[PDB]
C-alpha cells in the first residue's frame, strides 16, 4: 500500500540502483528471475515487498524503478545481465546519444526526446500505485544525464504530481578528487534547480566512502561496487521502517517534517554504523552506545566535512535490529551531554529516534559484517556550508577565465543561468549563516 517510486538517472544512479535492487531482492527473498521461491501459501499475507515490488498475476514481482540514461551502455548491460528478467522491458529506458558531462546538453537537447517517454512510464507506475507517497531519485552531481536530465525530470515531477516527498540521493564531488573538469559547473547548475524542487536531498561523495572502506572495512582495494553497496545499505536502512515492524516506525512524511527546519535547509548527511568487517566484529561488543558514538564521530561521516565545526540542528536515529529503547535513551543522553557535539540553541529536542525490529541483511560477496545493530544516522548539520564554499571556489576558478563556457554557450544555455545559479548558492550560504548564528 505504501508505494515508493525509484528513479535512477545517469550512470551513477543506475549503478547505485544496480546494487540497491540486488540488496532488495536478497532482503525480500525474490530471486533474480523475479520468482519468489515460495508463494501465497506460506508467509501469511506477504506484503513486505509492496514498497518496491509489485506482484503481477502468476507471482512475478516487478519493481517500481525507472532506469533512465542517455547513453545506451550501462543500461544495456542492465538489460543483459543477471537482472534481465526482473525489470520491465520498457522501464529500462535508454537514450540515443550521451549528454557527456554537460548540463546544457542534458537540459536543452535530446533530454527533451526521452522525457515524454520517461514521464509516461512514471505515470504508468504511479497509476499502478495505490497510495504512492515518495520518490527516490538516485543520481550524480558530476554532470550530463545525472545533472541536467535529473533536474529536468525533477522540475516536471514537481509541476505534475504537486505535493510529494521527492527524496534525492546525489553523488557529490569530493574536495581533492573528482573525475570530470566541468563538475563545478554541473553542481552549481543542478543546485539552482534542486534547491526549490527537492525535499530532503541526501548528499554523498566518494572520498569519505573510500576512507571508511580503508579504515573500518580493511579494504585495501575499494571500488564503486563497495561504494554502491554501502549506499544501498543506507537507503535500505532509511526505508526499512516502511516494510518491517518495530518499536517506532518512521515514514517519509515524519522524516521530512523532522529533518527540515526551514524550506531551504534540506541537505542532511547520512552516516551508517557500524561499517565494520567480520574480523574486527569478532573482537567487540557492538552495541547501542558505541554505535551512536561511531555515528557522531567525525571520522565516520560520509560527507567530507568536519561536524565538530558544525552547529547540528536536528538528526534522526534510524535503529535497525534488536535495539532496546532504554539503551537508546542512555546513548542519546550521553551524546547530548557531550560538549564537542554542538547543537543549535533553538532546537534542544533534536533527536528523532526510530527503531525497526528487522536486522540488516548482508549481501553475499560483500564487505560489511553481519551485525545485530545498525544506525542510519541522518543529521541536518551546518558543516555542509564547507562543501558549498569549496564548490563555489571551484566555480569561481572556472568562471574567472571563462573556461569551458563555450560548450554551454554554443549548445544554447546563456550566461544568465550561470549568474543566477551563483547568486542562488550565495543566498543559500547566507541562509546557512543566518540559521547558524
Amino acid at each position: 500500500m505504501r508505494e515508493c517510486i525509484s528513479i535512477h538517472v545517469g550512470q551513477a544512479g543506475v549503478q547505485i540502483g544496480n546494487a540497491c535492487w540486488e540488496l532488495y531482492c536478497l532482503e525480500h527473498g525474490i530471486q533474480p528471475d523475479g520468482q519468489m521461491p515460495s508463494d501465497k501459501t506460506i508467509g501469511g499475507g506477504d506484503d513486505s515487498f509492496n514498497t518496491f515490488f509489485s506482484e503481477t498475476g502468476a507471482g512475478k514481482h516487478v519493481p517500481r524503478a525507472v532506469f533512465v540514461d542517455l547513453e545506451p551502455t550501462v543500461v544495456d548491460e542492465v538489460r543483459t545481465g543477471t537482472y534481465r528478467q526482473l525489470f520491465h522491458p520498457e522501464q529500462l529506458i535508454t537514450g540515443k546519444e550521451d549528454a557527456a558531462n554537460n548540463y546544457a546538453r542534458g537540459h536543452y537537447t535530446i533530454g527533451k526526446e526521452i522525457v515524454d517517454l520517461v514521464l509516461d512510464r512514471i505515470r504508468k507506475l504511479a497509476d499502478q500505485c495505490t497510495g504512492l507517497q515518495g520518490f527516490l531519485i538516485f543520481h550524480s552531481f558530476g554532470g550530463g544525464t545525472g545533472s541536467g536530465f535529473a533536474s529536468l525530470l525533477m522540475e516536471r515531477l514537481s509541476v505534475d504530481y504537486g505535493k510529494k516527498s521527492k527524496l534525492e540521493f546525489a553523488i557529490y564531488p569530493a574536495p581533492q578528487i573528482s573525475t570530470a573538469v566541468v563538475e563545478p559547473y554541473n553542481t552549481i547548475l543542478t543546485t539552482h534547480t534542486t534547491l526549490e524542487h527537492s525535499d530532503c536531498a541526501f548528499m554523498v561523495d566518494n572520498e569519505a566512502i573510500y576512507d571508511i572502506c580503508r579504515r573500518n572495512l580493511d579494504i585495501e582495494r575499494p571500488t564503486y561496487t563497495n561504494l554502491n553497496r554501502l549506499i544501498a545499505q543506507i537507503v535500505s536502512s532509511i526505508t526499512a521502517s516502511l516494510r518491517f515492524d518495530g518499536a517506532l516506525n518512521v515514514d517519509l512524511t515524519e522524516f521530512q517534517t523532522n529533518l527540515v527546519p526551514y524550506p531551504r535547509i534540506h541537505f542532511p548527511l547520512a552516516t551508517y554504523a557500524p561499517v565494520i568487517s567480520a574480523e574486527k566484529a569478532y573482537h567487540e561488543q557492538l552495541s547501542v552506545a558505541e554505535i551512536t558514538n561511531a555515528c557522531f564521530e567525525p571520522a565516520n561521516q560520509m560527507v567530507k566535512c568536519d561536524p565538530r565545526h558544525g552547529k547540528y540542528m536536528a538528526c534522526c536515529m534510524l535503529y535497525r535490529g534488536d535495539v532496546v529503547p532504554k539503551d537508546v535513551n542512555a546513548a542519546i543522553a550521553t551524546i547530548k551531554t557531550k560538549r564537542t557535539i554542538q547543537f543549535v540553541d533553538w532546537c534542544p529536542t533534536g533527536f528523532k529516534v526510530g527503531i525497526n525490529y528487522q536486522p540488516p541483511t548482508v549481501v553475499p560477496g560483500g564487505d560489511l559484517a553481519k551485525v545485530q545493530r545498525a544506525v542510519c544516522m541522518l543529521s541536518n548539520t551546518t558543516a555542509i556550508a564547507e562543501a558549498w564554499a569549496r564548490l563555489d571556489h571551484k566555480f569561481d576558478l572556472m568562471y574567472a577565465k571563462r573556461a569551458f563556457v563555450h560548450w554551454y554557450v554554443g549548445e544554447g544555455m546563456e550566461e544568465g543561468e550561470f549568474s543566477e545559479a551563483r547568486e542562488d548558492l550565495a543566498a543559500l550560504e547566507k541562509d546557512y549563516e543566518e540559521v547558524g548564528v
Partner: protein, 431 residues
C-alpha cells in the same frame, strides 16, 4: 549506438589505417576473411560501431581509403588483413598530389572530393547515430594534408554537429623527411583549426624514441611504429565499444579537454611499455601505469612537458582494476606536480575506466593531453615558414597552380595567433 566513420588519406593514412584495422579487428575477433572468429559476444554487442555488417557473418568496416594515386591501395589489398575492406570505398585519383597542398586542395584533389563525399554520405546514411568522423591523415604532406583538410571542411559543413577527430603526424623537429613540409603543415593546420573538434598530433621522433630506448628492438622496423600508433588510436574509443566502469565518449573527452574552441590540439600516450628483456621485472599496476603516463619520455608528440603545463589531461584505463587506485594516483600527480599544472583549473584530469583490455595485456593505459608545451611544434613550424617565406622558397607551384600570397599571410596569422593563445593561457595566473 554511436557509429564513427573512419577515413585514411595518403600513404601515411593508408598504412596507419591498415594497421589500425588489423589491431581493432584482432581486438573484436575478425579473421583475415572477414567473418567472426572471436571469443565473446562482448566483442559483438557493439561491433557495428566500426563495421557495416552484411547478411550472415560478414563484418566489413566503415573505412574510406582515399588518395590521388592508386598505389598504397594495391599495397594494402596485397598486404595482410586487406581483403576485409570493401572494393566500393576505394575512391582514388590517377595523377598523385604527393606533397603539394595546392594539388591536394584546389587541383585534381578537388575534383575527387565529389565522389569522396558521395561515399561518405552513403556510409553516413547507412547508419542510425553517426557519432563522428575519424581521419588518420598526414599533417605536412600533399594528399594527406590538402585533401584531408578539404574533406574535413566539407564534412563539417554538411554535418555541423558531429565529433571530428583527426590523428595526424607532426612535422619533425630534427631531420626533415620532406623539404616543403612547413608550407604543407601550415596550410593544413590553417584549415584544420576551425572544423576538427580534436586533433591528436603524433610525432616521428617520439615513435622511434619509445621503441629504441623503451622497447629496445634494435632495428625497430615500421610496423611496430604503426602498431604503437594504432594502440592509442584503439584505446581512445574504448568507451564507445566495450562496457565497464565510468566511461568517456568522444564528446565527453572533447568537452573535458577543450576549454576554448581553438585549444583542441592534444598529445597522445600509450603506457604499458616494458622492454622485452625487463618485462618480467616490472609489476604492472595502476601506479606503474600512472608513472609511465606522467613521464616526459612516453609522450608521442615530442614537446618535453617540463617546458610547459598541461591544460587538461585525460586517462583511459582498460582492465579489471579499482577506482580508488586510478583516482588516488591522479590526486597524487596533481598535488605533487601542481607547479607543472595549470593553477586556475582545479582537477584538470579526466579518468575513464573500461574493463576490456587489448590483446596481450592484462591492463592497459591510454594518455591524452592538452598541454601548454605543444606550442613548440607550431612555433618551430611558424619559424621555418617565416624563414622560407622571407627568401621566397618553393612557391611558384602554388602561385601558378592556384594559390595567392594572401592565403599564406592568413595562414601565418592563424599560426602566430594560435601560439599567442597557448602562451597567453599558459602564463596567466588564477587571479
Amino acid at each position: 549506438m554511436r557509429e564513427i566513420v573512419h577515413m585514411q588519406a595518403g600513404q601515411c593514412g593508408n598504412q596507419i589505417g591498415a594497421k589500425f584495422w588489423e589491431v581493432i579487428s584482432d581486438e573484436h575477433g575478425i579473421d583475415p576473411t572477414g567473418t567472426y572468429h572471436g571469443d565473446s559476444d562482448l566483442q559483438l554487442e557493439r561491433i557495428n560501431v566500426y563495421y557495416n555488417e552484411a547478411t550472415g557473418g560478414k563484418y566489413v568496416p566503415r573505412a574510406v581509403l582515399v588518395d590521388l594515386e592508386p598505389g598504397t591501395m594495391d599495397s594494402v589489398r596485397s598486404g595482410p588483413f586487406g581483403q576485409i575492406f570493401r572494393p566500393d570505398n576505394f575512391v582514388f585519383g590517377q595523377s598523385g598530389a604527393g606533397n603539394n597542398w595546392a594539388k591536394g586542395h584546389y587541383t585534381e584533389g578537388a575534383e575527387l572530393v565529389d565522389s569522396v563525399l558521395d561515399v561518405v554520405r552513403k556510409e553516413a546514411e547507412s547508419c542510425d547515430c553517426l557519432q563522428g568522423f575519424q581521419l588518420t591523415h598526414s599533417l605536412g604532406g600533399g594528399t594527406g594534408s590538402g585533401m584531408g583538410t578539404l574533406l574535413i571542411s566539407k564534412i563539417r559543413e554538411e554535418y555541423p554537429d558531429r565529433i571530428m577527430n583527426t590523428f595526424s603526424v607532426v612535422p619533425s623537429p630534427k631531420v626533415s623527411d620532406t623539404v616543403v613540409e612547413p608550407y604543407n603543415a601550415t596550410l593544413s593546420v590553417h584549415q584544420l583549426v576551425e572544423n576538427t573538434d580534436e586533433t591528436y598530433c603524433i610525432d616521428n621522433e617520439a615513435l622511434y624514441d619509445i621503441c629504441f630506448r623503451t622497447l629496445k628492438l634494435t632495428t625497430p622496423t615500421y610496423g611496430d611504429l604503426n602498431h604503437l600508433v594504432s594502440a592509442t588510436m584503439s584505446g581512445v574509443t574504448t568507451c564507445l565499444r566495450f562496457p565497464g566502469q565510468l566511461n568517456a565518449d568522444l564528446r565527453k573527452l572533447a568537452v573535458n579537454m577543450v576549454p576554448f574552441p581553438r585549444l583542441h590540439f592534444f598529445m597522445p600516450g600509450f603506457a604499458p611499455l616494458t622492454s622485452r628483456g625487463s618485462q618480467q621485472y616490472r609489476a604492472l599496476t595502476v601506479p606503474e601505469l600512472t608513472q609511465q603516463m606522467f613521464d616526459a619520455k612516453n609522450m608521442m608528440a615530442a614537446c618535453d612537458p617540463r617546458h610547459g603545463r598541461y591544460l587538461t589531461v585525460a586517462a583511459i584505463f582498460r582492465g579489471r582494476m579499482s577506482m580508488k587506485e586510478v583516482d588516488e594516483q591522479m590526486l597524487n600527480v596533481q598535488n605533487k606536480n601542481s607547479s607543472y599544472f595549470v593553477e586556475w583549473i582545479p582537477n584538470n584530469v579526466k579518468t575513464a575506466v573500461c574493463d576490456i583490455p587489448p590483446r596481450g595485456l592484462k591492463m592497459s593505459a591510454t594518455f591524452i593531453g592538452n598541454s601548454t608545451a605543444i606550442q613548440e611544434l607550431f612555433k618551430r613550424i611558424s619559424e621555418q615558414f617565416t624563414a622560407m617565406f622571407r627568401r621566397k622558397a618553393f612557391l611558384h607551384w602554388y602561385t601558378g597552380e592556384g594559390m595567392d600570397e594572401m592565403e599564406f599571410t592568413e595562414a601565418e596569422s592563424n599560426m602566430n595567433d594560435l601560439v599567442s593563445e597557448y602562451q597567453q593561457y599558459q602564463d596567466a595566473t588564477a587571479e
